[model samples]
Target: PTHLSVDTKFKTEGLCVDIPGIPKDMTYRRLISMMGFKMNYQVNGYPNMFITREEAIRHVRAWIGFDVEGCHGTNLPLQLGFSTGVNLVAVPTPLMYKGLPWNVVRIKIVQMLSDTLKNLSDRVVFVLWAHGFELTSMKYFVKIGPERTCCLCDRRATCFSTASDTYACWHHSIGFDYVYNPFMIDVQQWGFTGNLQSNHDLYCQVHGNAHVASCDAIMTRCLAVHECFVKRVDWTIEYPIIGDELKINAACRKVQHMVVKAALLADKFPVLHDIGNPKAIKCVPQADVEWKFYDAQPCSDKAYKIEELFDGVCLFWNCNVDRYPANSIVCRFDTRVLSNLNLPGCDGGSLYVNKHAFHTPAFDKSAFVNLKQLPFFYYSDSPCESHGIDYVPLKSATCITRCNLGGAVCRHHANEYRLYLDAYNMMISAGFSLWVYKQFDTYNLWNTFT
Candidate 1:
C-alpha cells in the first residue's frame, strides 16, 4: 500500500492559460496548476505544459469520456488531464460553465467524472475542487442526483436546467417553506433551566415529533448551509465554542467523509482505485488523537502520522496549525473496505460519530480494554447522510416567541450536532446569525462585547 501525502509542488510550475481555449483575459494560474498537479508525472515537463483547445478536447474526451464543451466557450474544459497511467485522470472545474450556479456546475462535473470512472477499463479516481460550498454540494452530487430542490426554500431549486438551457434563484426572495427542520436550539445555554408548558411549546416549534418529509431534502439543506458556515468563519482565529478554529475539526472530518464516499463512488463506478479503495490502502491516521487543545503540542506528537487527509485542510495548515479543536474524535468506518485497525489506547464505540458506547462480548479483550468489550470502533454501514436532527426554516413567529419563553423549545432533536456545528459556523459566516450578533454589539469601556 502506498502511503503518501497530497503534494502541491506541481501547482507552482505553470501559467493558468495552459487549458485549451482559456481566453487571454481569463487565463487563471490556479486552474492551470491544478491540471499540472494531476498530470505532472506524464511526459517530460508535461505538468507545466499547456495544450491547444483541440488537444485539450481530445485529452478530456479520453479523460472524462466526452467533450462537455458545446456551443459555449466557457462550458468546455478550462484545464483537463490524463495522468500517463490507465489508472488516473484529473479534470479541474471547466470554464464552460464558470458562471453557472456553482451547485449546478459541480453537479455537472461530478456526473462527467462518475461516468468516466464507472466505465473505464481500469479503476480511476477523478479529482476537482471548487471555491467553497460546492465541495459539499459536489460530495452530495456524486451520490445523489442534481435534480433535488432546496429544502429551506420550500424545496425549490436555486437553479434548474433543461437539455438546452439553465436558470437560477435566491432563497430569501421567495418566502421560506412552512416545512421546518423542527430541530431544537440550545435552551439551557439560552438561560432556561426548567419550565413545563412553555418547554413543550418550544419543543413543538424546534424539535417537534414531526415526521421527516424527505431525508434527501434535509441532507441537501445541511450540506449547503454547512459550506456557507465554514466559508464565512475566520479560520485564522480559534473559534469560541470548540476552542480551535472551525477548520481544525473541519479538515479531519472532511477527509474521512470524502475518501469513503469517493471509494464507494468508485465501487459504484474499480481496479486500482488504491486511494479511494480503503481495502487497497489503509490510511491509518493518528489513532483517535483528540484535538488536544487549539495549538498545544500534546497532539502535535500525533499529527505527522495523520498525513494528507483532505486537500484544503492540508494546505490550510501551512499558515496556521494552532487553531483547531482541542478534543474531538476523527473517524469514519467501512469494514469491508477499511480494514479493522486497533487505534492505540482507545475503547470501542459505535463506528458512527457520537453514537452511544456499547458493550459486546469479545475474545481478545485484554488489559488494553474492558475484558468483555472491544477496544476499537467499528463501522460497517453505508456512508451516513443523516446529520441526525437539525433546524430547517421554522414555520411561525409564534414558534419563535414560544421558543423564547421555553428553553427546551429551541433545542435540536435529530440533526447530528457535531457535523451541524460546523455548518452552524458557516451560517455565522454567511450573515445568517451574525446579523443578530452585530445588532447586539456594544462598545464597552474595556472592550466591545456582542
Candidate 2:
C-alpha cells in the first residue's frame, strides 16, 4: 500500500517526488525541510517521526512485550509483567509451603505464565530484551509435545519426549522453539544506541514508573515499536540458541578417548612415549634397537633378503602373510650395538639409511661386506623409509620424530597429522567408516604410511 513517483528530471535537478500517503498540499520546500528534520532526529539518537502512533499500534497487532524477574543466583522467575500498549498485566508467583522444593515453585510459575499466554491470540509475537536469561528463567515450564521435535538444530535426537520435560539441551533450553514465534523480536539486538538503564529511565520519566515488571514491560514495548516501526530499523527473528552442544560433547569425548588410548599406547610401546610429552622417551635401549632394510634389488645379498624372496614379508605386523604373498619386502638387524658409535642420520636413539646411497653400485656390496661396521655412504643428510626401523609410532609421534622421517614441515604439520589420525580412528571405531573414507580420500599419507 505504499507508492512513490519521481519527476523525470529528479536525478539531475535533485529529488522531487509524489507519494500517495503524504499530504497533497505540502510544498516541495516544506517536505525537504521535514526530511532534514527527520535526518537530524536520527543523527541525534532519536526515533524517526515517519510512522504515526496509530500506524505503529496497527503494525504490531496481537503483540505482547514481557519481562521476568528471577530469584537472585537461582534464576527462578518470581514475577512476570506483560503489556499490549493499552493494557498491562503483572503476576507474582504464588507462595507455596515453607519446605516446598525450589523446582516445584519453578514449575508453578511457568504453568501460570504459559496458561496466561495461551489464552492470547495464537499469532501474538512475544517481545523481550536480551531474551535468553528471561526464557531460561521459565525453561522448566516450557515444553514441546511428543508430536513435535526441536527445530533449532534440525536433529531429532535432541528433541524433547514430553511436554513436562525441561528444554535445557540446546542453548537456554528446549522451550526456545515453543516460546519463539517467527515474528518475535529481541529489542536489545535491534541496534538501539542507548543502554537499557538509560532507555528505561527516559521511558519512566515520560510514563511515571521504574523497576517494576509491568513498567519494564511497558518500556520494552515503547522501545520496540519506536525502533521497529517508526524508525523502520531491521529486526532479527533468530536469537542465539545452543545448537552445537551435542557436537561439542561428542568431540570432547572422542578427544578424551584418544588421549587415554595414546597414553596406553605410550605405555605398551615405549617408543611412543614422546607422543604426549617430548621428554618421555629420551633415548632407546640397546635391546630395543633394530635396523630395518627393504629387501629390494640392491640389498639382495643379505640372508633375510634371500628368505624374503622365498617366504615374502609382511609390512603390517598383524597381516596374513599367506593370503597376501609378496605384499611388502623388509628385514631387520637387531644384533648390532649402536650406543658408542657416532652414526650419521641417527636421532633420538634411532638410525636411518638414506635412499640415495642404495642406488650406488658399490654401496650395496659394501653394506654386506662389513658385518661389524655400517657402509660409509649409507648414512646421509636426509632420512628415508628404506632401511629405517618399522616403527608404528612414527605416524602418531611428535614433531621431532615426524620431521626426522620427512613427514612434516614442523609443529603445525605434526599437530594436523595427529589430529586427523585421531579423528579418523575415532570415526572408524564409531561405525562411521564410510564417512571417514569419503572425508580422508584426498589425504593419501594417512592411508599409505599409517
Candidate 3:
C-alpha cells in the first residue's frame, strides 16, 4: 500500500522517523533548515515545490510530529522525520506549485532526508550511544545467562515476574548486576583437571576459569587480525578482551608497592639497602651488617638516649659511609621516616627514662611491633613532669603529685618518638619536663598517644 516514485519529494508517513538528539521545541524547524533543498541537478528542467512562504513553514512543521504516536513510537524513544503524506520535487524555480501537485515535490525531498537520516541513526546500532543518547548503553555483542532455573525463594526475593506469579527474572534471588556463567568460562583449575570437559546441554551453565583463559589468549592473538579489518572503517567494533591490550595491572601494582616500601626503607637507612650488592654484602655464615655497623661498635647499654640516636647533623639521601667517605656531600635527606618502620632510638620495645629503667622492652623492634601493653608500649627519655613552683593557695582541690604530658613525637613509638619530640620542642623553644607533666592542659592517655 506504499507509493513508489522517482525524482520527487514526499513526506514519510509510513517510514519511521528514527533520528535522535534534535531539541523538542526546535526539532521540526531544525530538520527543515537542514534539508537545505538545492536545485535537483539529476533531473532535466529543475522542478520545485511551489508554496507560499507560510505554507512552506507549515509543510516543514508537519514533518515534525507534535506527538509520539504520530512518529510511530509509543512509550518508547523516537527519531526525527516527516510524518505528513506529501511529496517534494526539487526544482530551479521562482515559480511555485501548490496543493496536491506539491505531494510530488515532497517525494524527492523525503528521499534525500530519508537517506541522510538513515545514515545518522545507523550511527547508534548495537554500540552504547554517546551522551544525550542512552546513559548505560553498552554494545552487548555477547550475553551471559540465568545460571539457575530454580530460584532461591529462601531470600527476600522469590523468582517470579513474567506471569506476575512464581516464575520471575530472579532479580533479587540471583542479583541485579549478576551476569551468569554456566558455560564454564573460567573452567581450568590451576595446573590441570583430571578429565573434565563442558557440555552446553549438561546445564553446567557458568563459564569457568579454563574457558576464560582461552578466551583471553584468543583475544590477544586475534588483535592483529581484528585490526586489519578495522583500519579502513571510520568506526569499528573490538572485543575488548582480545581486541584491546592485555595488562597485568594487579601484579604491576603489588610489585610497585614492594618497590616503594623497599625504596623508602633504603632512603631512611643506607646501612641496610641492598640494591647493587650482588657479592658485596651477603655472607650467610653468621656475618652481616649487624656485625659490622653496630655489633663491633656495640653501643653501650647507657649510650642510647632519645635525642642522641638521630643526632646526625648531616644527611645523605641513600649513599652510605661504605659507599662514600665521611664528610662527602652526597644528597639531602630527613631520616625521620624510619620511626614509622619501628627504627631509631628503640632497642627493644619500651621507652627508657633512667639508665636502669628497663632496656630490652624499650629497644627491641620485634617487641615494638608485637606490643600488647604500653607502659611497655612507649618510653620517653625526655621527662614529661612539671616544676616545684607553687601557686598562692587559692582554689579548692587537693594537691596532686603527677601531671599529664602527652604529646606526639615525629616517630610512631617510644624513645625515638621522644627524641623527635625533644628536637621539635627545642627547635621551637618549647619546654617539657618530667617535673611538669605539662605546663599546658595535657593528659597521659598511655599508648592512646605516641
Which candidate number maximizes TM-score? 2
Tell me how candidate 2 scores on lDDT.
0.32
State which candidate, 2 or 3, has the greater lDDT.
2
lDDT of 3 by residue, 74-143 (tens): 2332221121222221221212123222223333333432332221211111111011111111111111
Ten consecutive residues with minimal summed lDDT in candidate 1? 179-188
Name model 3 segments beyond 4 Å from true.
1-171, 174-183, 186-270, 274-450
Per-residue error (Å), model 3, residue 247: 22
Could you tally the backbone clashes for each prediction?
33, 3, 82
Candidate 1, residues 196-263, lDDT tens digits: the string is: 22333331222221222111112222222122221122222221121223443364444444333332
Clashes of 1: 33
Lowest-sum lDDT 10-residue window in model 2: 340-349
What local distance difference test score does each model get? Answer: 0.23, 0.32, 0.22
* Shift in Å, residue 397, candidate 1: 52
Top-scoring candidate (lDDT): 2
- 409 Cα displacement, candidate 2 (Å): 99
Question: What's the CA error at residue 220 for candidate 2, in Å?
Answer: 0.7
Estimated TM-score for each candidate: 0.18, 0.26, 0.14
Runs in model 2 lying further than 4 Å from the true structure: 1-59, 73-79, 84-120, 145-183, 200-206, 231-450
